[PDB]
């Protein structure tokens, strides 16, 4: 049900805002100078663009010198309440040359 993120300043993308989406066949990435969702969803002008409980998915995002850097890891789990007590390290996914003044962010959920 959890599927993506928006990063930027206004998040409406009237000025450049990053968007990252998983659609169960691909990951899709956009920065588009066009109006984004006002109350964000997935149904159950793009200066940069790219295309590729029992589970825990971990991510790190950082934004340095116009690059946006992503790390991740996937693991089994046996606790819903708190994060696991053990140690593990995330590994790099992608490193994106986007050049954007990110200060605020929001996750995306699928809706009926």
């Amino acid at each position: 049900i959890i599927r993506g993120w928006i990063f930027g300043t206004t998040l409406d993308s009237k000025t450049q805002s990053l968007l990252i989406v998983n659609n169960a066949t691909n990951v899709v990435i956009k920065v588009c100078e066009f109006q984004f969702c006002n109350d964000p969803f997935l149904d159950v002008n793009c200066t940069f663009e790219y295309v590729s409980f029992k589970n825990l998915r971990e991510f790190v995002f950082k934004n340095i010198d116009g690059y946006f850097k992503i790390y991740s890891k996937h693991t089994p789990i046996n606790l819903v309440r708190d994060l696991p007590q053990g140690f593990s390290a995330l590994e790099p996914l992608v490193d994106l040359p986007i050049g954007i003044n990110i200060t605020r962010f929001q996750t995306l959920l699928a809706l009926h």
Binding site: T10, T15, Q16, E33, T47, D65, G66, I100
Partner: protein, 49 residues
């Protein structure tokens, strides 16, 4: 005048950062909000090539 430069005002621009308009940079204390007089309008020019 098809060649342009956008900024000179105050809060400066980071290495490989990019900027595109939505609300007016004005040089002082005035709520200019579309006005183009003293301190007002974008710090945005065109070259006389």
């Amino acid at each position: 005048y098809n060649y342009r430069y956008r900024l000179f005002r105050k809060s400066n621009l980071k290495p490989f950062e990019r900027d595109i308009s939505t609300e007016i940079y004005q040089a002082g204390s005035k709520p200019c909000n579309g006005v183009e007089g003293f301190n007002c309008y974008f710090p945005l020019q065109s070259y006389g090539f």
